[PDB]
Design an enzyme around this catalytic site. Sequence first.
Site, mmCIF file in Angstrom:
data_model
loop_
_atom_site.group_PDB
_atom_site.id
_atom_site.type_symbol
_atom_site.label_atom_id
_atom_site.label_comp_id
_atom_site.label_asym_id
_atom_site.label_seq_id
_atom_site.Cartn_x
_atom_site.Cartn_y
_atom_site.Cartn_z
ATOM 1 N N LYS A 26 -27.739 -51.280 -15.110
ATOM 2 C CA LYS A 26 -28.591 -50.092 -15.314
ATOM 3 C C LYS A 26 -29.476 -49.869 -14.105
ATOM 4 C CE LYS A 26 -27.376 -49.930 -19.792
ATOM 5 N NZ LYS A 26 -26.606 -48.781 -20.370
ATOM 6 N N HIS A 136 -21.254 -59.683 -4.665
ATOM 7 C CA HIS A 136 -19.813 -59.908 -4.941
ATOM 8 C C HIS A 136 -18.885 -59.020 -4.126
ATOM 9 C CE1 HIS A 136 -20.907 -62.470 -8.210
ATOM 10 N NE2 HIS A 136 -21.314 -61.531 -9.040
ATOM 11 N N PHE A 182 -19.087 -65.157 5.676
ATOM 12 C CA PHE A 182 -19.620 -66.071 6.669
ATOM 13 C C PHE A 182 -19.076 -67.502 6.554
ATOM 14 C CE2 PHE A 182 -21.903 -62.703 8.290
ATOM 15 C CZ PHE A 182 -22.640 -62.078 7.327
#
Length: 369
Positions: A26, A136, A182
């Site tokens: 939200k 993500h 990374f």
Amino acid sequence: GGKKKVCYYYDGDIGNYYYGQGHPMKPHRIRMTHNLLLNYGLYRKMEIYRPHKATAEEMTKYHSDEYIKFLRSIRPDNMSEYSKQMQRFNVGEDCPVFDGLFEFCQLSTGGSVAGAVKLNRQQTDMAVNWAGGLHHAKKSEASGFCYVNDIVLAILELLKYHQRVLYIDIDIHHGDGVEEAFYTTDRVMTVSFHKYGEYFPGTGDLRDIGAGKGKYYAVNFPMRDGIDDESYGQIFKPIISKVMEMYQPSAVVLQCGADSLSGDRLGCFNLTVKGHAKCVEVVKTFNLPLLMLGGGGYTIRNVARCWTYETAVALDCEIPNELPYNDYFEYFGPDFKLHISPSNMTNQNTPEYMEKIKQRLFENLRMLP
Ligand SMILES: O=C([C@H]1C[C@@H](c2ccccc2)C[NH2+]1)N1Cc2ccccc2C1
Ligand SMILES: [Ca+2]
Ligand code: NA
Ligand SMILES: [Zn+2]
């Protein structure tokens, strides 16, 4: 080490983006956060900037051109034409198509990159982007409600001026997209604390330590349900202290995902706002340029409390537990207080488990030069 200059990034339209009916993410929680902290008077102590909309040029510093072109083109009205592309880029289920998706990405990202620029220019000590922290997102795929990896983009900006950047992730989920970006460099060390075991994204085992030049520069602290303030506090400070000693970064990015709080609709940790914010206090003691980002959090009243209190921590500004009146006041019932209590849930993370995982990570940290 003195009080710090804080620049805070917010666009008033962010709260209008809607992932769809039933979707737990939200964006409105960012607007609740903002309104709450304005009503505490924290705008008097910090500079507030409206982020630019990050361009497709800025995003393709990390993401593939094909993926960004897809995100810029896909809309609820043309989804039928893009069914194949939706599956290739992992869009349409956890990462829905919604009106203004690309603009949401642009504003989320713009805040993180603008904050990193401000840090690079030595015009602030801390920069805050509660709309960021989308850990993500991958080079050419959406994942876990994340489309553009604002964190990776901000770190790439910092790497223009900083030889070594430390990333710390206290979201309940593993910061897999940041780790992956990374994983084979020693110029960014990634440190994630997260729930591990039958839990999204399924990565962040203790044994994932990096590869190539990045071997020993990825650090993962897997946890069980029910971790509490005392247990978390007793590993976080020693780990981060050892990391700071051995890695000696010159800038830090801290992802402050609030889904590690007690009572989170999706998370199964038991931290209070004080326990979560202790992480901010610990990182702040090292007096390094610091980019504080948002992240998860699904009990939206507690997200607003958490990030309001963490903005106050950034500012060394004591605020009352009695909530001020604000546009969302009824969301903070029945108590109308800033701070929260832990639940009675069992902590599955025994003191011995915590010490043992810590000791294993310390053995890995001894392999740095
Ligand atoms: O909380 C998470 C992930 C999202 C990530 C995020 C932060 C800010 C804005 C968008 C996204 C924070 N951590 N989840 C991923 C996932 C995947 C599948 C089922 C539940 C969940 C919950
Ligand atoms: Ca984490
Ligand atoms: Na690395
Ligand atoms: Zn999360």
